[PDB]
């Protein structure tokens, strides 16, 4: 019992963190096999982050200009290349701590753990989600760039995010490990406003099921609804529309609790229309949307 | 920018987790040097958790009855002893992954990270606090016993908690690594109700300072208060009394923000007396009390 915002154990990823310095900029890199991945803005000075031509700036860089350090030991860079917004630094040594891994590009609504790092050293781990506007609400300071987001399935780390920047609003933007930004963001110091940060409905429903499993049941009502009626309410409250694909994904939680998905939707509709009335659900006074249905089952089943 | 419930990177502790089985009970153990620490209730059957005499039950156990497995490899037990509510199993092999470590007994209000484990394998990491009633609000299932709580200072892991049980209310109780329970709890399947779960005032104030540092400032008011006036309000709202020791600890955050501690107390008094009015602070609709002043500075400074 109990329900917490839980991150994956970070050990497998800690063993991959390295420091990358180019010129006067230092950030984090991810060392997998004989390649170090890092944001390409490591090559920029502050004076050219305003409008950088990365291909042109990269011409003035050689392998010896990329200083890569794993703990206190220096790695020898024998090649470099740019793939989208990331640099791939080939080193002469395979990381002996390389876990089984995959690079995945996640969809909005999916959650992941972040290992916030500075100077190639891990500071902390937390859980977050790819927002519907393609930002993440992380906790990152200067030097955190190159920290990564990931999920773990038994022994395989699926890396999904690499941090690149903070928007003027204090929300975060970055790429997958192929260097493609999530959303429309660009690695440049210019006006980039985020779109509507819509609530992830299927995750709210999953967390209401977690609340029932963990004994918080006051919000269950005598009502039901339809997908189309529920979606009228979701639109009004800046919630993502619920689809039959989302209903299907909530099947296991509906089976565990005996609460039909559309009945849980009617409970959520009443909470949206009436608020919490000063009450809490799983220690929160708001509807939590950064637990997926998979996260709830995993946490409520103890998958290792 | 951004502020998250952040746990310490769990790698150093993952390397210490082992599985301990005695009879038909399996739980987690912590392997440091040549000793494995685990809850003494590993020796109990369900039939004797009602009123166990641990010294008597332990007489029927020999070193070969304690099966200790680190990953897929078995450890040889060459000694065993009971220290308070923990068993210490001496093994013939020092854990090669033993980090620099200390055993500390924490005070209520202090936070720590938990690495929830099942079968000696880590499932997840989360942050929590020792509540003023000496329980923790964790996320633990059957088999999680022996999972540990810790803090990290650079390269030293200070272990502060070992999980032993869940109370009928779904809150958690356990010991320090010397086997002494936090609070009045006993390792027995009997009536153990928790006391008032009081809010940790100094942590709420620290988190209001984190909110100001991160730009959430709507709650700052034109008022001040005194410790004695503030404490009249704290009593009414089941908040811990604020002392000059707590004011002293909030000094660095007061200096960073330029907001005198007693002014922040007057802001907190107004939030207690008037509520949030449907507004949020750092993405929460309630006053968060599981960030210490040290956690706020650490997170807002990027200590690795
Ligand atoms: O935003 C940047 C640098 C940057 C600027 C413009 C474009 C690009 Cl690609 C990168 N880095 C940081 N990232 N996250 C949190 C930060 C908190 C404070 C200062 C810096 C932060
Ligand atoms: O409570 C116990 C076993 C136990 C019973 C009485 C006394 C003692 Cl010392 C230990 N273990 C568990 N711990 N945390 C969460 C749990 C969720 C479900 C089931 C079991 C859980």
């Amino acid at each position: 019992s109990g329900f917490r915002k839980m991150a994956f154990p970070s050990g497998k990823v800690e063993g991959c963190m390295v420091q990358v310095t180019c010129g006067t900029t230092t950030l984090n890199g991810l060392w997998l096999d004989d390649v170090v991945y890092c944001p390409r803005h490591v090559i920029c000075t502050s004076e050219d982050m305003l409008n950088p031509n990365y291909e042109d700036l990269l011409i003035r860089k050689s392998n010896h200009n990329f200083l890569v350090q794993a703990g206190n030991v220096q790695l020898r860079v024998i090649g470099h290349s740019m793939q989208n917004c990331v640099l791939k630094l080939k080193v002469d040594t395979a990381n002996p701590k390389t876990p089984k891994y995959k690079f995945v590009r996640i969809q909005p609504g999916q959650t992941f753990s972040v290992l916030a790092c500075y100077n190639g050293s891990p500071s902390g781990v937390y859980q977050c989600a790819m927002r519907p506007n393609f930002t993440i609400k992380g906790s990152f300071l200067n030097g955190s760039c190159g920290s990564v987001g990931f999920n773990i399935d038994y022994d395989c780390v699926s890396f999904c995010y690499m941090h690149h920047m903070e928007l003027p609003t204090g929300v975060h933007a970055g790429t997958d490990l192929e260097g493609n930004f999530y959303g429309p963001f660009v690695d440049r110091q210019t006006a980039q406003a985020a779109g509507t940060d819509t609530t992830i409905t299927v995750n709210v429903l999953a967390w209401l099921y977690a609340a029932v499993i963990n004994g918080d049941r006051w919000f269950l009502n005598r009502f039901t609804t339809t997908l189309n009626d529920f979606n009228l309410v979701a639109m009004k409250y800046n919630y993502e529309p619920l689809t039959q694909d989302h209903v299907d994904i909530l099947g296991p939680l509906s089976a565990q609790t005996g609460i039909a998905v559309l009945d849980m939707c009617a409970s959520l509709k009443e909470l949206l229309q009436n608020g919490m009335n000063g009450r809490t659900i799983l220690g929160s006074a708001l509807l939590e949307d950064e637990f997926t249905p998979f996260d709830v089952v995993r946490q409520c089943s103890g998958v290792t």
Side-chain angles (χ1 to χ4, degrees), chain A:
Chain A
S1 88
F3 202 76
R4 280 276 180 188
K5 191 61 69 66
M6 177 177 299
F8 286 97
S10 59
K12 287 161 187 280
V13 176
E14 290 170 53
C16 303
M17 302 309 307
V18 295
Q19 177 186 87
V20 180
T21 300
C22 188
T24 70
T25 301
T26 291
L27 44 60
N28 307 284
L30 180 71
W31 181 22
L32 295 169
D33 306 325
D34 59 352
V35 178
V36 174
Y37 300 84
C38 73
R40 63 177 180 175
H41 76 245
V42 74
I43 73 177
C44 306
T45 64
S46 304
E47 203 191 9
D48 59 31
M49 276 309 302
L50 303 174
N51 189 30
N53 188 305
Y54 286 98
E55 208 66 70
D56 292 341
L57 292 176
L58 201 54
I59 293 175
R60 311 293 168 207
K61 298 306 183 191
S62 300
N63 292 326
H64 70 267
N65 290 130
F66 295 101
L67 305 173
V68 183
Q69 196 181 319
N72 270 350
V73 315
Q74 213 70 27
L75 305 182
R76 189 176 297 276
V77 179
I78 59 173
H80 68 273
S81 66
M82 176 167 62
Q83 175 178 12
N84 301 309
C85 300
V86 298
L87 296 178
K88 289 189 293 188
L89 306 176
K90 196 194 174 167
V91 292
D92 76 350
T93 301
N95 180 359
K97 297 181 194 175
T98 305
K100 289 186 191 168
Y101 75 93
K102 287 180 177 178
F103 287 168
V104 302
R105 182 172 182 85
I106 60 168
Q107 288 275 274
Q110 299 299 118
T111 59
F112 55 97
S113 303
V114 172
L115 181 70
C117 290
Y118 299 84
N119 299 114
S121 298
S123 58
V125 64
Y126 53 86
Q127 190 71 355
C128 57
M130 180 52 56
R131 299 310 309 174
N133 62 11
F134 295 100
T135 65
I136 75 168
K137 293 220 182 83
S139 175
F140 291 118
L141 302 173
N142 181 58
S144 61
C145 308
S147 297
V148 303
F150 59 95
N151 283 273
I152 310 174
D153 185 25
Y154 166 51
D155 60 356
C156 182
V157 185
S158 291
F159 291 103
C160 57
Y161 178 82
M162 176 167 282
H163 188 51
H164 286 240
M165 72 194 194
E166 193 165 72
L167 301 185
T169 59
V171 303
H172 302 112
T175 70
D176 60 20
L177 273 290
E178 301 185 336
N180 290 125
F181 266 90
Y182 283 98
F185 308 109
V186 294
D187 41 5
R188 189 173 145 199
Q189 189 119 87
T190 62
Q192 307 188 62
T196 306
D197 195 358
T198 290
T199 301
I200 308 150
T201 311
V202 66
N203 287 7
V204 177
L205 289 166
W207 169 86
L208 291 175
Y209 277 111
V212 174
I213 290 170
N214 290 286
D216 279 4
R217 312 167 54 100
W218 64 263
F219 58 83
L220 294 179
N221 62 35
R222 304 164 166 280
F223 322 138
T224 197
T225 183
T226 63
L227 271 188
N228 289 168
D229 177 59
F230 176 75
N231 283 334
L232 288 188
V233 179
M235 166 105 61
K236 174 170 183 72
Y237 287 97
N238 300 130
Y239 265 61
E240 285 286 306
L242 199 72
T243 67
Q244 184 63 39
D245 274 5
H246 294 139
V247 173
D248 288 351
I249 292 162
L250 291 164
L253 284 169
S254 176
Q256 171 84 46
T257 61
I259 299 163
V261 177
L262 290 170
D263 298 1
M264 193 65 87
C265 291
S267 277
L268 174 51
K269 167 178 159 189
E270 300 300 301
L271 289 173
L272 287 180
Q273 292 175 342
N274 296 311
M276 314 269 292
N277 285 121
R279 295 185 281 273
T280 60
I281 296 173
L282 290 174
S284 183
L286 52 73
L287 300 171
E288 298 281 345
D289 77 344
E290 298 190 350
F291 294 101
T292 70
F294 296 96
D295 294 340
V296 171
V297 164
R298 190 186 302 111
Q299 181 168 171
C300 301
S301 76
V303 168
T304 56

